[PDB]
Amino acid sequence: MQPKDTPELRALYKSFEEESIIPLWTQLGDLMPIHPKSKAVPHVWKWSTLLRLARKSGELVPVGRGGERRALGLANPGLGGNAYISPTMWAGIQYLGPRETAPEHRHSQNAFRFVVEGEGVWTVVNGDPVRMSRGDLLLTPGWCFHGHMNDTDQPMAWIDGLDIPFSQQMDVGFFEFGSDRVTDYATPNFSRGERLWCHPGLRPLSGLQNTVASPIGAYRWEFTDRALTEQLLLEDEGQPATVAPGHAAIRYVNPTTGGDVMPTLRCEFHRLRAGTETATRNEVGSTVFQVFEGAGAVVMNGETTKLEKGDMFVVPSWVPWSLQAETQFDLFRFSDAPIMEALSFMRTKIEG
Amino acid sequence: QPKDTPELRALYKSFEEESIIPLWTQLGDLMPIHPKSKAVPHVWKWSTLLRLARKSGELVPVGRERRALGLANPGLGGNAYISPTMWAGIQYLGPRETAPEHRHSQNAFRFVVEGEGVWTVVNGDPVRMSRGDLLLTPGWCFHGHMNDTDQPMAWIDGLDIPFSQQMDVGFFEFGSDDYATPNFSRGERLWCHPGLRPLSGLQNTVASPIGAYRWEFTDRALTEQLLLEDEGQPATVAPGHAAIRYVNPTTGGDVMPTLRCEFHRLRAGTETATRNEVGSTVFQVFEGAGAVVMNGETTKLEKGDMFVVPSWVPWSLQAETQFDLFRFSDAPIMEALSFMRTKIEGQK
Amino acid sequence: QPKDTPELRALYKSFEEESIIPLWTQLGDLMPIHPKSKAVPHVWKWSTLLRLARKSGELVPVGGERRALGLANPGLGGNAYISPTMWAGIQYLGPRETAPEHRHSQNAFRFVVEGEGVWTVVNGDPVRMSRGDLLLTPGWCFHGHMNDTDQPMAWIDGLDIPFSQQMDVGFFEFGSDRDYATPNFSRGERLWCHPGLRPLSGLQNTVASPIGAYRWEFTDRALTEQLLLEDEGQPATVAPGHAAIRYVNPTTGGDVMPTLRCEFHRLRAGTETATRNEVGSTVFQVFEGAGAVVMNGETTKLEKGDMFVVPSWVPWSLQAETQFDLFRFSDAPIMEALSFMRTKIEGQ
Amino acid sequence: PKDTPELRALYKSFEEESIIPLWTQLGDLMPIHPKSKAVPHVWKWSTLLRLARKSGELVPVGRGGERRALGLANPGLGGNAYISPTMWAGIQYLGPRETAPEHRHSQNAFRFVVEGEGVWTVVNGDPVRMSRGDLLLTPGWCFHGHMNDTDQPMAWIDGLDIPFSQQMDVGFFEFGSDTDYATPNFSRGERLWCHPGLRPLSGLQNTVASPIGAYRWEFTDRALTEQLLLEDEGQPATVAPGHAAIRYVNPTTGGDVMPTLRCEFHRLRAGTETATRNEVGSTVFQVFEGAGAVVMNGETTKLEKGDMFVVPSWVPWSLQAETQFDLFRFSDAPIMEALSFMRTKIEGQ
Numbered sequence A: 001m002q003p004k005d006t007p008e009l010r011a012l013y014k015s016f017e018e019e020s021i022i023p024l025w026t027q028l029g030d031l032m033p034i035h036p037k038s039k040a041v042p043h044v045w046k047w048s049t050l051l052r053l054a055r056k057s058g059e060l061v062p063v064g065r066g067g068e069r070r071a072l073g074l075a076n077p078g079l080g081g082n083a084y085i086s087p088t089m090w091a092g093i094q095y096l097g098p099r100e101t102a103p104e105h106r107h108s109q110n111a112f113r114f115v116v117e118g119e120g121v122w123t124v125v126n127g128d129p130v131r132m133s134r135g136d137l138l139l140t141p142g143w144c145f146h147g148h149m150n151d152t153d154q155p156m157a158w159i160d161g162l163d164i165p166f167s168q169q170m171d172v173g174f175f176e177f178g179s180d181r182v183t184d185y186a187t188p189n190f191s192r193g194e195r196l197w198c199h200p201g202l203r204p205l206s207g208l209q210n211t212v213a214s215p216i217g218a219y220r221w222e223f224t225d226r227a228l229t230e231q232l233l234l235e236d237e238g239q240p241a242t243v244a245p246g247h248a249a250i251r252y253v254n255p256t257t258g259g260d261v262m263p264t265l266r267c268e269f270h271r272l273r274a275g276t277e278t279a280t281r282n283e284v285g286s287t288v289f290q291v292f293e294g295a296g297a298v299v300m301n302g303e304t305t306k307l308e309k310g311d312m313f314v315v316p317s318w319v320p321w322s323l324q325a326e327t328q329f330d331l332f333r334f335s336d337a338p339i340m341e342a343l344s345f346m347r348t349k350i351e352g
Numbered sequence B: 001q002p003k004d005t006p007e008l009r010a011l012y013k014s015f016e017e018e019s020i021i022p023l024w025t026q027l028g029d030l031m032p033i034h035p036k037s038k039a040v041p042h043v044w045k046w047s048t049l050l051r052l053a054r055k056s057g058e059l060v061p062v063g064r065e066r067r068a069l070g071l072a073n074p075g076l077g078g079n080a081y082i083s084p085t086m087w088a089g090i091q092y093l094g095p096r097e098t099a100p101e102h103r104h105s106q107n108a109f110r111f112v113v114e115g116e117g118v119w120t121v122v123n124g125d126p127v128r129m130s131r132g133d134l135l136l137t138p139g140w141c142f143h144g145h146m147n148d149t150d151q152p153m154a155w156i157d158g159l160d161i162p163f164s165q166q167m168d169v170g171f172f173e174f175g176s177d178d179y180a181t182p183n184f185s186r187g188e189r190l191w192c193h194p195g196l197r198p199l200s201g202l203q204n205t206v207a208s209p210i211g212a213y214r215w216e217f218t219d220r221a222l223t224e225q226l227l228l229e230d231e232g233q234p235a236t237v238a239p240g241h242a243a244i245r246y247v248n249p250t251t252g253g254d255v256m257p258t259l260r261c262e263f264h265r266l267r268a269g270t271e272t273a274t275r276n277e278v279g280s281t282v283f284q285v286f287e288g289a290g291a292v293v294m295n296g297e298t299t300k301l302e303k304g305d306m307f308v309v310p311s312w313v314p315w316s317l318q319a320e321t322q323f324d325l326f327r328f329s330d331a332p333i334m335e336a337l338s339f340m341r342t343k344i345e346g347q348k
Numbered sequence C: 001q002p003k004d005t006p007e008l009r010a011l012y013k014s015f016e017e018e019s020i021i022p023l024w025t026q027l028g029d030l031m032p033i034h035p036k037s038k039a040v041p042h043v044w045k046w047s048t049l050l051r052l053a054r055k056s057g058e059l060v061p062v063g064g065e066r067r068a069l070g071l072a073n074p075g076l077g078g079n080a081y082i083s084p085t086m087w088a089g090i091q092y093l094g095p096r097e098t099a100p101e102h103r104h105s106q107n108a109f110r111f112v113v114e115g116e117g118v119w120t121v122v123n124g125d126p127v128r129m130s131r132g133d134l135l136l137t138p139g140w141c142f143h144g145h146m147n148d149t150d151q152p153m154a155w156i157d158g159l160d161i162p163f164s165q166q167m168d169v170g171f172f173e174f175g176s177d178r179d180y181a182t183p184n185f186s187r188g189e190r191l192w193c194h195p196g197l198r199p200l201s202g203l204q205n206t207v208a209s210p211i212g213a214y215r216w217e218f219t220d221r222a223l224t225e226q227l228l229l230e231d232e233g234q235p236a237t238v239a240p241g242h243a244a245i246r247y248v249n250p251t252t253g254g255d256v257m258p259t260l261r262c263e264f265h266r267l268r269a270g271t272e273t274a275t276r277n278e279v280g281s282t283v284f285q286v287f288e289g290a291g292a293v294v295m296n297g298e299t300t301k302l303e304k305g306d307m308f309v310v311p312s313w314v315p316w317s318l319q320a321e322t323q324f325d326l327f328r329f330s331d332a333p334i335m336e337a338l339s340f341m342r343t344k345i346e347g348q
Numbered sequence D: 001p002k003d004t005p006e007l008r009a010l011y012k013s014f015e016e017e018s019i020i021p022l023w024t025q026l027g028d029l030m031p032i033h034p035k036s037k038a039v040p041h042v043w044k045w046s047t048l049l050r051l052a053r054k055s056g057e058l059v060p061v062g063r064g065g066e067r068r069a070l071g072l073a074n075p076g077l078g079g080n081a082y083i084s085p086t087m088w089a090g091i092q093y094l095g096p097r098e099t100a101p102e103h104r105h106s107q108n109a110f111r112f113v114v115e116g117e118g119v120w121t122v123v124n125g126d127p128v129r130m131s132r133g134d135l136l137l138t139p140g141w142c143f144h145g146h147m148n149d150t151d152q153p154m155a156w157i158d159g160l161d162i163p164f165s166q167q168m169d170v171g172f173f174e175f176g177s178d179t180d181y182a183t184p185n186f187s188r189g190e191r192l193w194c195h196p197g198l199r200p201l202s203g204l205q206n207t208v209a210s211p212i213g214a215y216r217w218e219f220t221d222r223a224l225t226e227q228l229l230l231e232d233e234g235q236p237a238t239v240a241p242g243h244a245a246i247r248y249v250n251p252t253t254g255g256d257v258m259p260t261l262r263c264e265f266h267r268l269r270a271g272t273e274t275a276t277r278n279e280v281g282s283t284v285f286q287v288f289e290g291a292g293a294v295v296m297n298g299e300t301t302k303l304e305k306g307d308m309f310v311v312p313s314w315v316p317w318s319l320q321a322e323t324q325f326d327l328f329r330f331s332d333a334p335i336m337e338a339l340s341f342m343r344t345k346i347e348g349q
């Protein structure tokens, strides 16, 4: 507003209200901001806290009661009690107890599982049984049947990433329950997907068709490790490879395409040489990082926070960020960048 | 229902104290069986809109930053979103009024309803405006406009404002950094020759270089589809239903990354087959009369009226007279991200 | 740089039996420093062509029916290829003459030079022909034609015949099918020739353009606009005084067919294009006006109708004496799909 | 055609004006279906090897010699040295401690190693070790030379789009000076790109040809074994029963290794007979291990370790495996597919 206030002016606004009209001129210039100004706020979650609350939940929330969906969603303080870590992503610590099972469902929302501690648990994706290990990235791409079974007396914890907040806000979700059909879990070290698609530079003649989401069920830790190590080795030998000095990094990729793992979520993994400081970045859309191994710190909006093994933080859109590595510093990273990029909304500013 | 009320509420005090919401005590269906939008089917009478528009010209002066009446969906909590993704508003430009140049990441179009002799200048290139024309002001293009007449004009503004706001994607720069008045923009003179492409424009483009999709061509196109059907030839999307998509000529795809525009002409008496579609559309009755059915409920429609079909709401159109509709939607978003799904009642 | 007799002669014989040819005995120009085509720069004067075409008019009667004079490149050993990839012939259709429908994997167009009132029927869709029109008969579409006039017509036939023969890619079928109707404009154009608009019934992208005829009015207007824009100080022409368009597939923005690019150029009187080296072949046809070509430093004066071929990597430029209108086709889509295109421009 | 009177002296003018008329013309300018001048043919490895070794001490470094490559010449291509209208296939014989200086050409090339080791092909400065079973790429416009670091010979298959490139006038060539002699176990390429499902953040840009310098035999063999094992386990994986196969692909894209050549590898279970296929364009196969037979135009030819054969366009072909039968395959299919000329007839359908 800025029409000089008036009995008739007020009459007008009355009739708006009454006809579902909201006028653009009274409309708080956050409607069209000079740059992104997210409701979501930068925030870190200490792993020691997450872990403690995870365990206690597996002492108090049994199957039948609340367990079954035993996942601690990280809720962004800025998102009015929604349980969104960012406008576009859901990130939760899922705590799977001894011998525990989940029946099969399917949903349009895209999802991954990054395993933090544990082993001997299979997520069965479209009938294909996928083993889980510390450091593995698992995909359960939209509209693929998934459930899981813990084959062990030991608990497991993984990060659950989904595009739930995007899909809720944009009205895009469907959900189906599995038929009464029986999932008699096989137990293989390697899923059929991996056995077919995890041979570098080779494609089976039976998979000539490109796919919207990756047919790789798990991107195993051995390969991620090997690839980052090799990037640092190359650097030592004076060869081009790292994204920036002392900065090893890979993007997990759909092999049929070279593109992202799934339409709405990008996954990366970074390894910072001890003492590396990344150049400050402004990026459209939101990212979540989790510290896999090592210790260092983040800077967001000029403010520093020390990080250790397991901690997670989110950088909402256009918040300037950089990472500083005390030790060798290994991070897992997911973002909503494919959304941004598909729609030409991506922009990047680099301090350097 | 959740775990035993076993004063574990000590655990809850903790969840709360450092920002955890457990999935298990969780909300409504945070993953619905099919979409159930907070946005709700709604129509706006043109009579109403125009009355209100004319008022805003009398009351809210010198054109402030903009005399645009955004259609607010009742179900989106006073946000000024016609749908979770799109902003649709009636903009009323008074006699001889002008707007300085701005530029924003949000994509926009302008569909002219009544008026003429108004130029929107896009990246320096002056684009005349007429009843029935579709104007693009693609993301990040400078735009402003001048009214060269004593007469008002009204057009509808479509933008991805809601998408942009909720997705944290918006940038904005000011301009007033060309009041020439040609019949046709530099872009139409270059691009509006069927099947031809300038050798200076071999680069494909994110959004269409066509500044204005003029009514002449839209009308001839549709008339030709109906003629062809009369002649027993394939053309119409469904019997008695002619339709086009406005497209980016460098690409054959949608006009902008984020918004699809179409235009429909239904023969009198036509009833479209009921459809469920992911995402929202907004239709505007350009000419003629008939009705919409949304969620089994009928609403009679007259020249100018607008309605919104939020995602997965089953809809059909029924044409009383020959029924001309302009249509825009968030379908490109849905399609680029493989979320599109379509259910059509006749089978198809 | 070679080995030398006795026991060696034994080897060269074993080779010859066992079908080996050694790399070393082979000529360096099996992998040349840059392209050196067997095909050679050459022009054909229109007056010649037309004289011969008419003479063929009498002298070979509908006997006749494949009455097309293929331009044979002196350097291609009596093959009837204008270049290693393309066939260009002048087709002379006599009064009231027709041709039955066939179909072949080889892509084809027809650029009409003189005449009217002839239809080429493409997949059942009747397409009128006029001076200046470009007609497409994409690979694997049925085509035949009917002259409905007492007057002859002459058009250029462009095809990938030489590419298709050397690459083993040809199929051919005869047409035992039924239409002699006479529409002013075809179904394809009726649907696709509205700038920036796409029928909802044509959402699928297609490998070759669905525009049957790219008519002269549109090409002419397009090029005039490009020169007008230039006059007005506006970006448009591809180089000073050089208007030009590429005929494109509207579903795509890409080339008319997988195998052949079509362009049209209009040079302002007095223009001299900068010398170009391009991979692959072009044929140009002077549509109106006069000027000259330079190829390998050698000038040839050109008048209305003349045609010339610039084989791969031969340096070429055009100079316009009057306003100079040229039709142009090339094998560049082949070159570009396979990342073999490279381009050198004298000024750069 | 027509008549004779004063037709003869018009035909004259044509000759003078350089016009061939459409009408007087072998109707196989536009054939019912492809009928290649190139002809089905097989080359016995034992012959290839003997002639390669003879060319050993007879054409040495200097006088010939750095181009010691025996191109397989298709009987039907009039003495051209083209195995097919599109491809050059030769056995290259690299003698002990022999080297080639660096060159660069628009024509795309690969090297499939048949016998030997301890030879490096250096691609754009990046040293690529060679072993039996490895596929090396030297994509168009990349600098390549090699050094043999061994007193032993090596033999590899040279595949190129030379014939395509010469008939289509597409060839460029530069000499290099230019050259590192280092001997790493794995090319820097491989070290960046050979981690399944992973892509370096320094390599986000897609490339026209694969950046993998060598597709090593370990991975080829493991992938094939796995497809057969999956079949055993009742799981979908093989292309047809008993028929494991992969396509070597550009990891930035999922597409072919280079714009103009496709490379595949086949492993047929003992006893397998593939279903007869007509395919547009040409293909060359090399028996890597095992024995069986080809059928081409209904005619059988028994095949042994190393043998090579070419199926020109639209010639109906099948393979029959006596033992387990491993084949390397390359084709001009990317050309045919880019230009929508590809067509496939398969016998079971």
Ligand SMILES: [Cl-]
Pocket: A205, D264
């Ligand atoms: Cl295949």
Ligand SMILES: [Cl-]
Pocket: C200
């Ligand atoms: Cl539609």
Ligand SMILES: [Cl-]
Pocket: none
């Ligand atoms: Cl050019």
Ligand SMILES: [Cl-]
Pocket: D201
């Ligand atoms: Cl990044």
Ligand SMILES: [Fe+3]
Pocket: A105, A107, A111, A146
């Ligand atoms: Fe799930």
Ligand SMILES: [Fe+3]
Pocket: B102, B103, B104, B108, B143
């Ligand atoms: Fe604006």
Ligand SMILES: [Fe+3]
Pocket: C102, C103, C104, C108, C143
């Ligand atoms: Fe034909």
Ligand SMILES: [Fe+3]
Pocket: D103, D105, D109, D144
């Ligand atoms: Fe070479």
